[PDB]
Amino acid sequence: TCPFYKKIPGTGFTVDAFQYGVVEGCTAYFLTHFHSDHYAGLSKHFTFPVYCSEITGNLLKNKLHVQEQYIHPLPLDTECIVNGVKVVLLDANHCPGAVMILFYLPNGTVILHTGDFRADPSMERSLLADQKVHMLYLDTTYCSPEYTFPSQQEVIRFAINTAFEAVTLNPHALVVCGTYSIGKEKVFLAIADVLGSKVGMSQEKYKTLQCLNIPEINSLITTDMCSSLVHLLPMMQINFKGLQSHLKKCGGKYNQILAFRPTGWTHSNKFTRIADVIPQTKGNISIYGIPYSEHSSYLEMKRFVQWLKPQKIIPTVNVGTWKSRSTMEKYFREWKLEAGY
Ligand code: NI
Numbered sequence: 001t002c003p004f005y006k007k008i009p010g011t012g013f014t015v016d017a018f019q020y021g022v023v024e025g026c027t028a029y030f031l032t033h034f035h036s037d038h039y040a041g042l043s044k045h046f047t048f049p050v051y052c053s054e055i056t057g058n059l060l061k062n063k064l065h066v067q068e069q070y071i072h073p074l075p076l077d078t079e080c081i082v083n084g085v086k087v088v089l090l091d092a093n094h095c096p097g098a099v100m101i102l103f104y105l106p107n108g109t110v111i112l113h114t115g116d117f118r119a120d121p122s123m124e125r126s127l128l129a130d131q132k133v134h135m136l137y138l139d140t141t142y143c144s145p146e147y148t149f150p151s152q153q154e155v156i157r158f159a160i161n162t163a164f165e166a167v168t169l170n171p172h173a174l175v176v177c178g179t180y181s182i183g184k185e186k187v188f189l190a191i192a193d194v195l196g197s198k199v200g201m202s203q204e205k206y207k208t209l210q211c212l213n214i215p216e217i218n219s220l221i222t223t224d225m226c227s228s229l230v231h232l233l234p235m236m237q238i239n240f241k242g243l244q245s246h247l248k249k250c251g252g253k254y255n256q257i258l259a260f261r262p263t264g265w266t267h268s269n270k271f272t273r274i275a276d277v278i279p280q281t282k283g284n285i286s287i288y289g290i291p292y293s294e295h296s297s298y299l300e301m302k303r304f305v306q307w308l309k310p311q312k313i314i315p316t317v318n319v320g321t322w323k324s325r326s327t328m329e330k331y332f333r334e335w336k337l338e339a340g341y
Contacts, residue, residue: 005137005314008113010105012083015113015137018042027083032115033098034059035181042066051082053089055097058211059182077127090126092117094294095183096212102127112308113137114316119296119304128308136310140317141295143328147265148298149291150274156190158274159260159290163191166258167229173256175230176246178238182208183294184262189220191260192230200228226253235261240282247285256284262292302335309341 006017012027018041023029031052032038042050044065049072052060057073060066074080076089076099086104094116103111110133117139167173175195177188192199199221201209206223214220222228233246238261247257258279268277269291279286296304305313313332318324 005316005319008103008111010107010109011085011103013085013103015101016115018046022048030101030113031056031060032092032101032113033094034063035095035116035183038116039064046070051087053097053099055212056099058213059097059208062211063208088127090123090128093120093123094118095181096185096214097182102133109134111135111137112310114139116141116294117296118294119300121303123304124307133308133310135312135314136305136308137314137316138301138305139295140301140315140328142265142293142298143301143315143318143331145298146270149265149269149293152186152292154274155290155292156186158277159187159288160190160194162288163230163258164194166256167195170256172254173258174247174250174254176238176243176257176259177230177232178235178259178261179205179232180235182212184292185209185212185214187260187262187290187292188230188232192220192228195229197229198222198224198227199230199232200225201232205232229254238287240285240287243285243287257286259285259287261287261289263289264293264295265291302331305332306335306339306341309339 002014002017002020002023006014008015012025013030014023014026015030016032016038017023018029018039028049028051031050034056042060042064044067046066047070050060050070051072051074054073057071060071061068074089076091080087088102089099090102092098092100092115098115100115100117101113110131112133114137163175175191188199201221203223206221209217209221225231238259243257243259247254266289277288279288315328318328
């Protein structure tokens with residue numbers, strides 16, 4: 001059965017709720033982004049209306065074979081009417097095609113559902129600036145002060161400088177980057193760009209990337225692995241065994257691998273700066289775990305909510321334990337007392 005925090009009161013709508021069969025009284029199903037915990041349940045046999053971004057719609061049609069007649073893409077930053085209710089889709093600064101959804105209820109209540117997001121001060125100047133929000137359905141993934149990580153720009157600087165140094169010292173080094181879903185494409189695109197290479201990958205992953213409207217993409221990616229010195233592999237294969245085996249397949253073209261695992265947060269964050277990050281090394285293989293996050297840090301999340309001043313917050317992540325819920329509720333009260341709303 002569909003949980004309460006995926007239902008929007010006073011509407012026919014649910015958010016990210018495709019794994020519960022036919023939801024009682026749901027007339028339209030919204031999908032914030034194409035990540036499997038959120039899309040779980042969609043396929044060619046789905047015959048209710050799905051509302052989403054253009055990019056999410058490309059992925060529904062091409063990757064899951066949802067029929068075109070049930071896909072309703074909306075433009076961003078544009079007031080739209082859906083089953084008699086005004087909505088707006090806003091950029092979530094998560095993975096490509098990810099949105100937040102503003103709902104303008106017929107009784108006058110305004111609700112923001114963030115989906116998954118990385119809060120940013122640029123959001124303080126979207127269509128959010130222009131009215132009060134009563135209820136916030138919040139991505140609370142890292143809602144605890146231990147969760148600090150650097151900006152995405154500092155992390156990309158580290159990666160480009162690391163890769164460029166390694167390959168300049170040894171022109172026979174291969175760079176590998178791990179992936180398992182959409183998101184974090186800047187990691188492998190920035191490295192390929194500094195090295196003057198395209199990124200090589202499987203046909204299935206190339207197809208996924210062609211759905212994303214990334215400009216000049218035919219220029220940066222390829223399925224010809226032989227012509228590429230930046231390769232993408234499944235995240236599961238980013239270990240010494242998996243990488244040793246890959247290196248065998250390259251036929252003596254290469255004699256060293258430098259690999260990157262973008263993670264979210266890891267506890268090496270609490271003690272070490274990005275500048276100071278070091279790899280795990282075995283023989284001719286080095287693996288860097290780099291803290292490239294597509295979710296809000298605690299301080300980014302706090303700043304957003306203190307700016308927005310919602311009357312009620314409904315967490316959508318970490319809701320399964322009493323200890324987690326209690327912790328999050330205590331931070332929301334601090335934030336409200338400190339800011340005066
Ligand atoms: Ni996500």
